[PDB]
Design an enzyme around this catalytic site. Structure first.
Site, PDB file in Angstrom:
ATOM      1  N   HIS A 114      31.965  40.445  30.844  1.00  0.00           N
ATOM      2  CA  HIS A 114      33.104  41.352  30.748  1.00  0.00           C
ATOM      3  C   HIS A 114      33.628  41.320  29.315  1.00  0.00           C
ATOM      4  CE1 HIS A 114      33.384  41.649  35.183  1.00  0.00           C
ATOM      5  NE2 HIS A 114      32.967  40.398  35.139  1.00  0.00           N
ATOM      6  N   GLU A 148      39.399  38.122  36.355  1.00  0.00           N
ATOM      7  CA  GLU A 148      39.022  38.184  37.753  1.00  0.00           C
ATOM      8  C   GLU A 148      39.080  36.775  38.324  1.00  0.00           C
ATOM      9  OE1 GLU A 148      34.819  38.849  40.041  1.00  0.00           O
ATOM     10  OE2 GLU A 148      35.440  40.473  38.694  1.00  0.00           O
ATOM     11  N   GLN A 188      26.685  38.805  34.674  1.00  0.00           N
ATOM     12  CA  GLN A 188      27.545  39.829  34.085  1.00  0.00           C
ATOM     13  C   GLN A 188      28.446  39.275  32.991  1.00  0.00           C
ATOM     14  OE1 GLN A 188      29.639  41.804  37.285  1.00  0.00           O
ATOM     15  NE2 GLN A 188      27.738  42.277  38.376  1.00  0.00           N
ATOM     16  N   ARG A 244      25.344  43.802  31.935  1.00  0.00           N
ATOM     17  CA  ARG A 244      24.397  42.963  32.667  1.00  0.00           C
ATOM     18  C   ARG A 244      23.627  42.065  31.707  1.00  0.00           C
ATOM     19  NH1 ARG A 244      22.711  47.261  33.395  1.00  0.00           N
ATOM     20  NH2 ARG A 244      24.225  48.707  34.332  1.00  0.00           N
TER      21      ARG A 244
END
Length: 388
Positions: A96, A131, A94, A271
């Site tokens: 971001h 994150e 992934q 993705r």
């Protein structure tokens, strides 16, 4: 009253472990469903509950009392989502997007009426918030591109897999790594088969990492261009207690292990491999920074103060800290809402006359107006909060 013992949602995604939460925390699973994520927070789709009422609703009624003035003013809600992630299978790679592109993507999808719950919806926030992932058991993952010389070395035994690899080997730079990355993801039919065959041959003639990681991924993603990504991206095996940031425009993947995960309630995800879903490759390339990140910069360096171990986060949205519990009470205070999670041992929390026991895997919500609370016991207590 002052300390709310959380009743938490378990997302039963197919990739989740059937035994991990039960083995670690004694959480019941008689049907043996795959338990992928334990959600601790106030997410609208599935908020945690308190004795029962929704924590989101409880916060909605008295935001300043629950969240504190600072958080209420800055965010207007519980600004973080706290998860236990149980990866039995490897997950997709992934990316971001950064703030600027997150606004545009968020706006683009809103301009075309794309619902927030739709599968086509990639952007759910007009901003990039980071994150943090914190290992509870040995945690295998990928994060960021390797040093160019490292990628060169790893791509030698599969140089004949694709012309774009040879192209990168000629001049190991950012723009050819970008071409390589995009070309790998855009491989079709026999172009894909040829490349994969070369890789699967190299697996038998190469030993150790990241070739072992490719073998682990290939069981679940045998026909996937993302099998080349451990040669491009840093493979990291976090020991329990170590932590990692997910940076913007930086490919990352969680492969196996159990870990704590702190994020903003809404997330933006492009993705980038290890997935059956379609990938807009130009959009992905536009949202990826093809700049190597050395292995030393991957782990977040925490700061120990007394019994507190803080993991500094470069944004005010959330803060993360571990608290080594002792038999003598230490005060755990904050100017915001907090979610305390017992990692190991046992945690006795006290606020005046009230007492709350937390066994490993259990959590409690502390409102801003109920800070501070005294914590004692054994093992470690994890806190998510705001340093505001």
């Amino acid at each position: 009253a002052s300390m709310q013992k959380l009743i938490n949602s378990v997302q039963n995604y197919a990739w989740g472990s059937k035994t991990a939460l039960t083995e670690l925390y004694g959480i019941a699973n008689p049907q043996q469903q795959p338990m992928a994520e334990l959600w601790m927070g106030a997410h609208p789709k599935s908020s945690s509950r308190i004795t029962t009422v929704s924590l989101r609703d409880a916060i909605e009624k008295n935001k300043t009392a629950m969240l504190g003035e600072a958080v209420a003013n800055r965010f207007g809600e519980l600004p973080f989502l706290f998860k236990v992630l149980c990866a039995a299978q490897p997950l997709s790679i992934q990316v971001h997007p950064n703030k600027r592109n997150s606004e545009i993507g968020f706006a683009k999808e809103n301009a075309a009426g794309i619902p927030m719950d739709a599968a086509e919806r990639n952007y759910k926030d007009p901003n990039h918030k980071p994150e943090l992932v914190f290992a509870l058991t040995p945690f295998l993952a990928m994060n960021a591109f390797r040093e160019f010389s490292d990628i060169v070395s790893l791509l030698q035994p599969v140089a004949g897999a694709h012309s774009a690899i040879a192209h990168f080997l000629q001049v190991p730079n950012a723009e050819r790594l970008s071409q390589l990355f995009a070309s790998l993801l855009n491989m079709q039919g026999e172009e894909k088969s040829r490349a994969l065959a070369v890789l699967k041959a190299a697996l038998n003639s190469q030993q150790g990492e990241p070739w072992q990681t490719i073998r682990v991924i290939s069981e679940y993603y045998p026909d996937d261009s993302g099998l080349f990504s451990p040669l491009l991206l840093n493979v990291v095996k976090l020991n329990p207690g170590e932590a990692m940031f997910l940076f913007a425009e930086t490919p990352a993947a969680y492969l196996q292990g159990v870990a704590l995960e702190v994020m903003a309630n809404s997330d933006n995800v492009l993705r980038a491999g290890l997935t059956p879903k379609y990938i807009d490759i130009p959009e992905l390339v536009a949202n990826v920074k093809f700049e190597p990140k050395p292995a030393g910069e991957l782990l977040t360096a925490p700061v120990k103060s007394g019994a507190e171990l803080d993991f500094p986060i470069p944004v005010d949205d959330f803060a993360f800290s571990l608290h080594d519990l002792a038999l003598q009470e230490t005060s755990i205070g904050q100017h915001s809402a907090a979610i305390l999670f017992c990692v190991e041992g046992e945690a006795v929390l006290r606020k005046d006359e009230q007492r709350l026991v937390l066994k490993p895997g259990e959590s409690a919500f502390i409102g801003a107006d109920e800070s501070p609370v005294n914590a004692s016991g054994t093992g470690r207590l994890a806190r998510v909060y705001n340093k505001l």
